[PDB]
Design a protein around this ligand. Structure first.
Ligand code: SF4
Ligand code: SF4
Ligand code: SF4
Lengths: 178, 306, 360, 67, 155, 56, 144
């Protein structure tokens, strides 16, 4: 199947019945009207604008945005320094130097993202075998400084100490689904 | 008094032109399926005064490029014509009668070119020199039709005086006897004042207000001047204020019309444009400015000189 | 006044991606291919996965193959809309642009709901697809696709009999057939001059084998018959969609093997072996065999293809991307010969300079 | 929607009505209820400057009443 | 009073300033595309007095979308010293902020901030059009707060 | 929606086809959010017998 | 009639927001006069109106209140607000708002959302959260 887009040139014995219809398509302009009267329809249509800060648009619960370190329902920081949430991070964005916690347990002393790195690709929320790191619906976190985006860990907990009311409902509709 | 009258001619068009720059963006949005300005004020009405005060706070662009006694004139010249380009224009009774007013329009309309040339010659830019020069021969080969299309029409009118046309349009519009003139007139209105599907200055940096002020100013005029010549509104002198109120909507239709164009079509490739006005209109046109001369000679009678 | 000799300066956006992949593994390098044809994402990923899948010697399952074709010809719809309209902007027409970029934003949401985000959807991985797509998605494409064959012919009402379009566009950039092949356009820019060719039917690879669609050849080589090809290729996705929509098989995603795909997240969490692979996939990765391929796929541009080259280490060894525009642009200074400025704008649009392909 | 432009129009649309109706009434205030009495040709001038030479220099008045 | 009023003026000086601003939206990359989706109906720019395509030399703001190579940089800064000098700057994209991908590459700049100042940084690899559209507003109150004559009175 | 049974005839006369049925944007009867949670299918080789890695 | 039915419908739009202050406020505040069914009214005043009849991006709109944590949120209105239970309802991720199915307390979540502090104080600053990774020496203050 191959389809000629433009094959209509055939000598149809162009007579005054029709050959002037092209001159009716010309000097008495109609094709231009046809292209104009269309546009005039839309100004009598429903403009799909939306008053953003008062009318924000649609997302879905898998939206890749700002990171956050989740926490178990009983305190207890959920991140445990596996060190594959940077080994996969293609931006090479992360440093998660760690230690024992002085409880004998296993947690971090360090965690990082350069959010100007961090392509927001989604490898880390899914590679995390614990859902300790996730990537939540914030996308109004523009700042005036390249430095205020270099989220260390205390921001990135207390961020995770904020949207946990929200993430635990999107993820509630996204477990048994990946 | 008289000063009090120009007080009612200039400020009542400078406000108008400003709300064209808005309505421009408001229609074309809705042509393009979107609201336009809404948060500058109630419904965008307060956009232009904001945009105005913006430019007139523009930090001091370094005045390069010449003895700046010419960078002062290009804006100040073209805008000056336009505000004067309205004066004879007779809403029911003109501010200024002119026995040759319709001819006073062309010169004032055509003399504005030196703004586009001198800004092109001042601006020591090897490209914009012959970049603001295409647009001049553009504006000029346009100017021919703007006379012929205007001239052959006034053949079956009397003198050049615009007060006559109200009388000539008593029972009838000049849209019907010459619908072709109007067609070739209309593009000849787009023609000068490039704000049209063809622009050729969008495909003069600091004082962009004045071009931005004069360009759109001539729009409402040259739309209006099409109404008062062809889409003749109703005079009926015991309530002459009607005429202006009917003169309004035609000027807004003819000006809403332009805005439908820019949000209809693309630019025109400045070789066709010549080919349009050196093969298609002008040879078509002379027959019409040969037709109407035979017309009263044929028909019965020629109009007067009062 | 007139052009004779033009010269581009193709370097203004290079980044070293071909180098920068050599120090990152396959899974770790996938989303770079979303960047090249930044307008049309998946189709790049559609190729990159295959260059892997050839070497690894796997056909992914049908349901994942099946959806890989669906978005694989929604991305077809994008770049046409992005170079039908932008080819109209720089020529001058600014309206259909906005009429579509609500119709186009309804076309990102069907990534946002399916993939993570709107545009750089790291959704198509070498082992099929990462993640199935939800329930309230496929009743929505019907409504969209139904209303969308109008939005085009709604536009074709306006432009494809428009003087300002036609004589701005016709007889422009007359491409000779046998000269295209000397330059290797190999996309739209040759079928628009009558060289009957399409890999999707001449070298079919995915489930395109049973679709019953058509190739809109263009005769009378000019950027209006390219344009009509670019239009009808948007239409004849919808024959493909309707056929790619009403017979989706229920099946599996993210290939059965846990060495070439990550396992189910509920399954790495009890079953040991699925945990280890999850710990080594996302650190080390596939461990491809050495070898080499030159894949291909006709994206909206044309024969997008990859000369991926491998080694027993998990990471590649000088991948290379075949930017189909890269040859279209070398012919820029031969097809604009005896033509003036203003159409050279049109030449750019009807060579589809989505630079990111051009740039590396 | 489609009608929120009208505050752009009807405001503009009660802008140009003024220089048509006002300038009518600015002339009629001066010239005494009549119009400006245009002077295209010379003969419209003698009648005027004649009428100027009949009363106080303004020329929109005295008619019959004398003889 | 003087100081009270100048405060009430600066709220007006910086109003016309912000209520209609004229960008110079670069292309260069994928990141470019979202501005067009922000020029689109849904998250329209023009509802704020923001103009879609304005010339550079009359611009009021820059919007950097995309990677920034070592080749384009002079062609960039040449523009920045051709705007006037209320010129504000907006750096869309993880590639302009700090070169999100290709931080480490060689034909690439590790942040637009390496070359020009920045009045706002904006994240996202493809920052959502809205995700800019809050940032552009954050710019539109970065200067509603700043006061030029209030301090000139003390000068 | 609020199309007053005249402008529809203005739209269609000005454009053509009856396009209130194939309108631009969407209102209702689509994607009634929070569809139920699905129990996915499983792939092959969850079969526990004649399932080695040699035959895959 | 036809036309008048719009105005029998378009007039409560203005006279459906209480008085004139309540109406004129909304106008300059958001330029959106649309009668909306209320479901919300959070802490610190976010109302989250609704109307299913409009199209897919205006069937839910929130009206912020003034007097955030010392910011005077009349003019300076953000989207970094809308705390983490309506954000998921407003962006059409879900259908059920957080009144019939609110989120689950976990006895460590914040009690008051802090918006996107741009350049004020009360903002982020980076650290080097690594415990200094070395231990040098100390002289004895005992000469010889
Ligand atoms: S974020 Fe997840 S994968 Fe990374 S160290 Fe923490 S628990 Fe491990
Ligand atoms: S989303 Fe991707 S790029 Fe961003 S931190 Fe996670 S793994 Fe790295
Ligand atoms: S940040 Fe992402 S979307 Fe933007 S230019 Fe870079 S790769 Fe493209």
């Amino acid at each position: 199947t191959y389809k000629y887009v433009n094959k209509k040139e055939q000598e149809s014995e162009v007579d005054m019945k029709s050959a002037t219809d092209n001159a009716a398509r010309i000097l008495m302009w109609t094709e231009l009207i046809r292209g104009l009267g269309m546009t005039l329809s839309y100004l009598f249509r429903e403009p799909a604008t939306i008053n953003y800060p008062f009318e924000k648009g649609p997302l879905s619960p898998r939206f890749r945005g700002e990171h956050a370190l989740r926490r178990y329902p009983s305190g207890e920081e959920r991140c445990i320094a596996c060190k594959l949430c940077e080994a996969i991070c293609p931006a090479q964005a992360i440093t998660i130097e760690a230690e024992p916690r002085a409880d004998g347990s296993r947690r971090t002393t360090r965690y990082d993202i350069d959010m100007t790195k961090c392509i927001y690709c989604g490898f880390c929320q899914e590679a995390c075998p614990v859902d300790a790191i996730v990537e939540g619906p914030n996308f109004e976190f523009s700042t005036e400084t390249h430095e205020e985006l270099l989220y260390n860990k205390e921001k990135l907990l207390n961020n995770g100490d904020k949207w946990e009311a929200e993430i635990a409902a999107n993820i509630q509709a996204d477990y048994l689904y990946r | 008094m008289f000063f009090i009258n120009i007080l009612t001619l200039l400020v009542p068009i400078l406000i108008a032109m400003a709300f064209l720059t808005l309505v421009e963006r408001k229609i074309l949005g809705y042509m393009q399926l979107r609201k336009g300005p809404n948060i500058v004020g109630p419904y965008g009405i307060l956009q232009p005064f904001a945009d105005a005060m913006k430019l007139f706070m523009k930090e001091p662009m370094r005045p390069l490029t010449t003895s700046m006694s010419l960078f002062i004139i290009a804006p100040t010249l073209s805008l000056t014509l336009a505000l004067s380009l309205w004066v004879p224009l007779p809403m029911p009774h003109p501010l200024i009668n002119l026995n040759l007013g319709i001819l006073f329009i062309l010169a004032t309309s055509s003399l504005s070119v030196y703004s586009i040339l001198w800004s092109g010659w001042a601006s020591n830019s090897k490209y914009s020199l012959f970049g603001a020069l295409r647009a001049v021969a553009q504006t000029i080969s346009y100017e021919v039709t703007m006379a012929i299309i205007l001239l052959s029409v006034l053949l079956m009118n009397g003198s050049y005086s615009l007060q006559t046309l109200i009388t000539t349009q008593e029972h009838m519009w000049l849209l019907l006897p010459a619908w072709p003139m109007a067609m070739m007139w209309f593009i000849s209105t787009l023609a000068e004042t490039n704000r049209a599907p063809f622009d050729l200055t969008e495909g003069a940096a600091g004082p962009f207000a004045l071009f931005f002020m004069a360009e759109y100013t001539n729009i409402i005029l040259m739309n209006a001047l099409t109404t008062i010549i062809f889409l003749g509104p109703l005079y009926y002198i015991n309530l002459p204020e009607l005429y202006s109120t009917n003169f309004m909507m035609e000027a807004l239709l003819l000006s809403s019309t332009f805005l439908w164009i820019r949000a209809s079509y693309p630019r025109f490739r400045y070789d066709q444009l010549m080919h349009l006005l050196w093969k298609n209109f002008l040879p078509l046109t002379l027959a019409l400015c040969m037709w109407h001369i035979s017309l009263p000679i044929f028909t019965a009678g020629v109009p007067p000189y009062m | 006044e007139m052009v004779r000799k033009c010269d581009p300066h193709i370097g203004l956006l290079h980044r070293g991606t071909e180098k920068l992949i050599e120090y990152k593994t396959y899974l770790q390098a996938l989303p770079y291919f979303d960047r090249l044809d930044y307008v049309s994402m998946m189709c790049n990923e559609q190729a990159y996965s295959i260059a892997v899948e050839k070497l690894l010697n796997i056909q992914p399952p049908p349901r994942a193959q099946w959806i890989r074709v669906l978005f694989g010809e929604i991305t077809r719809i994008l770049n046409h809309i992005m170079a039908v309209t932008t080819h109209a902007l720089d020529i001058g027409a600014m309206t259909p642009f906005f009429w579509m970029f609500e119709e186009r934003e309804k076309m990102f949401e069907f990534y946002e709901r399916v993939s993570g985000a709107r545009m750089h959807a790291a959704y198509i991985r070498p082992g099929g697809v990462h993640q199935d797509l939800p329930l309230g998605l496929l009743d929505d494409i019907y409504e969209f696709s139904k209303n969308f064959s109008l939005r085009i012919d709604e536009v074709e009402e306006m432009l494809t009999n428009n003087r300002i379009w036609r004589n701005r566009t016709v007889d422009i950039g007359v491409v000779t057939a046998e000269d295209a092949l000397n330059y290797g356009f190999s996309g739209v820019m040759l079928r628009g001059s009558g060289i009957q060719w399409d890999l999707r039917k001449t070298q079919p690879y995915d489930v395109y084998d049973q679709v019953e669609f058509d190739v809109p050849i263009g005769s009378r080589g000019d950027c209006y018959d390219r344009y009509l090809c670019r239009v009808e290729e948007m239409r004849q996705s919808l024959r493909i969609i309707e056929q790619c929509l009403n017979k989706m098989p229920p099946g599996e995603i993210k290939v059965d093997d846990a060495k070439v795909s990550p396992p189910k997240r509920a399954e790495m969490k009890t079953s040991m072996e699925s945990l280890i692979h999850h710990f080594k996939l996302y650190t080390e990765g596939y461990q491809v065999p050495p070898g080499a391929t030159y894949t291909a796929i006709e994206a909206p541009k044309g024969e997008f293809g990859v000369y991926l080259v491998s080694d027993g280490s998990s990471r590649p060894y000088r991948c290379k991307i075949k930017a189909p525009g890269f040859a279209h642009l070398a012919g820029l200074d031969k097809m604009s010969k005896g033509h003036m400025l203003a159409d050279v704008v049109a030449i750019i649009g009807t060579q589809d300079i989505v630079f990111g392909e051009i740039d590396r | 929607m489609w009608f929120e432009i009208l505050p752009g129009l009807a405001i503009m649309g009660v802008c140009l009505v003024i220089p048509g109706v006002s300038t009518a009434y600015i002339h009629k205030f001066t010239n005494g209820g009549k119009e400006k009495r245009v002077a295209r040709v010379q003969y419209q001038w003698y009648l005027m400057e004649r009428d100027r030479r009949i009363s106080g220099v303004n020329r929109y008045y005295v008619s019959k009443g004398l003889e | 009073r003087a100081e009270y009023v100048v405060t009430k003026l600066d709220d007006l000086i910086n109003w016309a300033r912000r209520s209609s601003l004229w960008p110079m939206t670069f292309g260069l990359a994928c990141c470019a595309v979202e501005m067009m989706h922000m020029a689109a109906p849904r998250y329209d720019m023009d509802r704020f007095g923001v103009v879609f395509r304005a010339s550079p030399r009359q611009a009021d703001v820059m919007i950097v979308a995309g990677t920034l190579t070592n080749k384009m940089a002079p062609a960039l800064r040449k523009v920045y010293d051709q705007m006037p000098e209320p010129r504000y700057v907006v750096s869309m994209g993880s590639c302009a902020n700090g070169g999100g991908y290709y931080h480490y590459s060689y034909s690439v700049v590790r942040g637009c901030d390496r070359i020009v100042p920045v009045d706002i940084y904006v994240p996202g690899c493809p920052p959502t059009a809205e995700a800019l559209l809050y940032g552009i507003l954050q710019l539109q109150r970065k200067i509603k707060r700043e006061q030029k004559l209030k301090i000139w009175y003390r000068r | 929606a609020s199309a007053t049974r005249v402008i529809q005839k203005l739209r269609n006369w000005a454009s053509g086809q009856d396009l209130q049925a194939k309108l631009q944007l969407r209102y209702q009867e689509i994607a009634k959010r929070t569809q139920p949670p699905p129990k996915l299918p499983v792939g092959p080789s969850h079969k526990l017998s004649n399932n080695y890695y040699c035959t895959r | 009639m036809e036309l008048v039915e719009v105005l029998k419908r378009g007039v409560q739009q203005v006279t459906g927001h209480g008085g004139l202050r309540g109406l004129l406020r909304v106008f300059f505040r958001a330029n959106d006069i649309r009668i909306g069914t209320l479901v919300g009214e959070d802490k610190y005043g976010n109302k989250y109106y609704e109307d299913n009849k409009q199209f897919f991006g205006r069937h839910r709109w929130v009206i912020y209140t003034t007097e955030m944590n010392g910011k005077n949120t009349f003019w300076d209105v953000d989207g970094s607000m809308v705390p983490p239970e309506w954000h998921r309802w407003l962006h059409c991720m879900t259908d059920d708002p957080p009144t019939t199915n609110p989120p689950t307390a976990r006895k460590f979540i914040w009690t008051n959302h802090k918006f996107n502090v741009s350049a004020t104080p009360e903002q982020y600053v980076p650290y080097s959260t690594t415990r200094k990774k070395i231990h040098e020496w100390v002289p004895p203050s005992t000469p010889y």
